[PDB]
Design a protein around this ligand. Sequence first.
Ligand SMILES: CC[C@H](C)[C@H](N)C(=O)N[C@@H](CCCC[NH3+])C(=O)O
Ligand SMILES: [Ca+2]
Ligand SMILES: [Ca+2]
Ligand SMILES: [Ca+2]
Ligand SMILES: [Ca+2]
Ligand SMILES: [Zn+2]
Length: 316
Amino acid sequence: ITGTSTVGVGRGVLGDQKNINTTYSTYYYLQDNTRGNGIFTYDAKYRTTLPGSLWADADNQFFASYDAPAVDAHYYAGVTYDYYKNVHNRLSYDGNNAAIRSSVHYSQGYNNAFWNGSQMVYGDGDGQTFIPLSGGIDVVAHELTHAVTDYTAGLIYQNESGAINEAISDIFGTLVEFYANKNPDWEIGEDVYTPGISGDSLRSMSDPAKYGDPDHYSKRYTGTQDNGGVHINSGIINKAAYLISQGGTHYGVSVVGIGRDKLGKIFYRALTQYLTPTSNFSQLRAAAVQSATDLYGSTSQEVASVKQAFDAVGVK
Ligand SMILES: CC[C@H](C)[C@H](N)C(=O)N[C@@H](CCCC[NH3+])C(=O)O
Ligand SMILES: [Ca+2]
Ligand SMILES: [Ca+2]
Ligand SMILES: [Ca+2]
Ligand SMILES: [Ca+2]
Ligand SMILES: [Zn+2]
């Protein structure tokens, strides 16, 4: 909508107060004009018609229970935009400042969030399995990273290419969570999963097998569920990424960690310069090796650690 840029205030899903960028034209809308061609947040009103209505508020205060998922979708889309611009020099998901659109209050009791090819979509959860999923910065950043991937490598969402697609979303979702630096970890979705249970998450990058996911190629899933295991086999790559950053010894193979910033640089370059729609795990290792060689040199510690991490998880 055409209007003037304003700054509202509200509370997110976890009860934290934050300032949001809004637009005033009769109502105050969740339209942030400060980032690219805008960040836009919509109300799906418990239905499944998308995007729904651009979020309108009479007073620019967003403290109602019903407001909280909107606040967080809007705010955390902004953080994710800032991460890509400031860390990777990328302007929105398409690299040309595409508008970022999100809808909240999708369906009733909907225990998921997704990128639909055009926008973000967030359920409210059923209140037991999940609370509203935009409350997780890693969740928001995971979903927006699918848009990045789709515009860049274009990894097909099945089998090994799909597990890479998922791992890239977990990797950058985590790196965004560290960038914001509130309560960061190498777990996925802990802030919105199972409010009645402390210390769990959907997936772990540091120890995928904590939630039943493989941490070595020899344990890969080859059945048909989950698009050939895209959220299962992602654990193999997630573990490799964790080892590259943090180091460790895994199945007897020791990796020297090189830290989060270098992990991000290596994987961002692989995603944007080397991976293709049909890349498999072997080809990801090659892409990451080439990326780290470009950035650091063939005889670098960074290259050595990339190779050691893939070796550790059985990917040649
Ligand atoms: C990043 C988390 C987000 C919910 C994502 N769409 C996801 O990982 N979903 C998988 C895990 C289950 C989510 C709720 N049932 C999924 O398999 O869809
Ligand atoms: Ca209000
Ligand atoms: Ca956390
Ligand atoms: Ca996390
Ligand atoms: Ca929990
Ligand atoms: Zn995903």
